């Protein structure tokens, strides 16, 4: 079954769409890719590497417009078309340049009944098994690249159709952290989404059955942010007001000096009125004003200075919908809250600064605790949505 694709196949991709892909990349990165592209597959240029790197250097010297060099690499160097490896390179370089434009969804791997399975991905073995499991059905081509500043291993999978050149489909991205049961994958609902994700579970297991369970239903962009939100890190399960525990800066080492221990110095605090004086309302002292503004930041950022303008939180989230159920007089009272915006917990912080919302009576879940998770709350306990 020779249905797999090598690194030299030339699909009949449109010139306009690949023109717009090179549009977003900066000038300095176009020079780097062109030099590496010729060293692997060559090109239609009638010259050596030294001749190529000479003329390309001169386009930099003259300040040549990028439209000229983009047309040069599309109509002179490779007029016939673009290689699959070149397309993968431009896609990954666009991924690095603009990480906020791509959304991700979390998924959990389980073995046995309820024992989480930490993934240990071999860069080599994970490839050929996936190729074998996918080429028995459809043409398959895969490419792996490691994040320059993150421990993840982003894998892109593209599938080709015969309708003769092959027609490329929308690529599927699956990101593997180093050692974490959570696996982040792109958003897709087609014939290929359930064929690629299912094949990965069989490939990575190799000895026992592994099933994938979606942790969330609302995608979040900024692959950098999702790693802090759900990947292997100290900040997971200690968000919101408890962010001071994630970075143990308030406590010194036992071997450290004991005069700098905050027991001697103490802390500066203000008395909070347990009697309800918020409803009815005098100009506050500037010192009292400063302390009042400090209380709001403590309950939304976790510390007076802030773990992270000032209203931006550590991880912005778009949509979170809570459900509060309480038992009063032997019956259940249900209140449903739905929030929408750019930074939900950042927005609530500003309203508390304008004295619209009492800061003493806001609960933990509204303050940012266990953020990005929406579910029912009972008896002071938070339950995630099934």
């Amino acid at each position: 079954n020779e249905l797999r694709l090598e690194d030299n196949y030339v699909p009949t991709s449109d010139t306009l769409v690949v023109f717009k892909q090179l549009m977003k990349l900066p000038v300095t990165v176009l020079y780097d890719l062109t030099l590496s592209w010729f060293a692997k597959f060559g090109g239609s240029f009638d010259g050596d590497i030294y001749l190529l790197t000479e003329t390309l250097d001169l386009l930099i010297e003259k300040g040549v417009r990028r439209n000229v060099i983009v047309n040069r690499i599309l109509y002179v160097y490779w007029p016939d078309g673009l290689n699959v490896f070149q397309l993968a390179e431009i896609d990954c370089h666009l991924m690095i340049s603009k990480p906020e434009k791509f959304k991700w969804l979390p998924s959990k791997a389980l073995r046995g009944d309820g024992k989480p399975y930490v993934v240990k991905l071999q860069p080599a073995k994970f490839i050929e098994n996936l190729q074998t499991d996918l080429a028995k059905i459809y043409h398959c081509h895969v490419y792996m690249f490691k994040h320059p500043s993150l421990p993840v291993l982003i894998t892109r999978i593209q599938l080709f159709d015969s309708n003769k050149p092959l027609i490329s489909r929308r690529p599927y991205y699956v990101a593997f952290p180093l050692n974490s049961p959570i696996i982040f994958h792109s958003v897709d609902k087609d014939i290929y989404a359930r064929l690629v994700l299912q094949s990965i579970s069989r490939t990575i297991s190799e000895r026992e059955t592994i099933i994938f369970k979606p942790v969330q239903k609302i995608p979040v962009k900024s692959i950098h942010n999702i790693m802090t939100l759900l990947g292997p890190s100290r900040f997971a399960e200690s968000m919101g007001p408890w962010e001071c525990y994630a970075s143990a800066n308030f406590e010194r080492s036992p071997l450290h000096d004991y005069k700098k221990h905050q027991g001697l110095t103490g802390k500066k605090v203000m008395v909070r009125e347990f009697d309800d004086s918020f409803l009815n309302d005098g100009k506050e002292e500037p010192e009292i004003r400063r302390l009042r503004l400090e209380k709001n930041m403590i309950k939304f950022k976790g510390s007076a200075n802030g773990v992270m303008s000032r209203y931006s939180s550590l991880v912005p989230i778009e949509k979170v919908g809570f459900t509060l159920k309480n038992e009063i007089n032997s019956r259940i009272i249900t209140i449903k809250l739905k929030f929408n915006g750019n930074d939900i917990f950042g927005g609530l912080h500003e309203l508390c600064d304008k004295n619209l919302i009492n800061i003493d009576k806001v609960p933990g879940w509204l303050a940012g605790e266990n953020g990005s998770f929406s579910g029912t709350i009972m008896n002071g306990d938070f339950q995630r949505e099934q």
Partner: protein, 82 residues
């Protein structure tokens, strides 16, 4: 808890079925315990009666020793008194 209507209905049906089979398992386990308790009680009663008759035989042997020694005419002492 599900927000979807059909999910709620399916979960309700599954819950009703699970309750039915749980009741069946409960009555089966109750019957098993009812058997086990009486079995253990009968075994313990048999053990008690056997050990009691063994004690009776031991007392008979002690009496045999005692009046054998009395026939011998040698003076006797008891360790519960010493």
């Amino acid at each position: 808890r599900e927000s979807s209507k059909a999910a709620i209905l399916a979960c309700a049906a599954e819950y009703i079925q699970k309750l039915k089979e749980t009741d069946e398992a409960n009555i089966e386990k109750w019957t098993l315990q009812k058997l086990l308790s009486e079995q253990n009680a009968s075994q313990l009663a048999s053990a008690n009666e056997k050990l009691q008759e063994e004690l009776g035989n031991a007392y008979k042997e002690i009496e045999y020793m005692k009046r054998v020694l009395r026939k011998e005419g040698i003076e006797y002492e008891d360790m519960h008194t010493h």
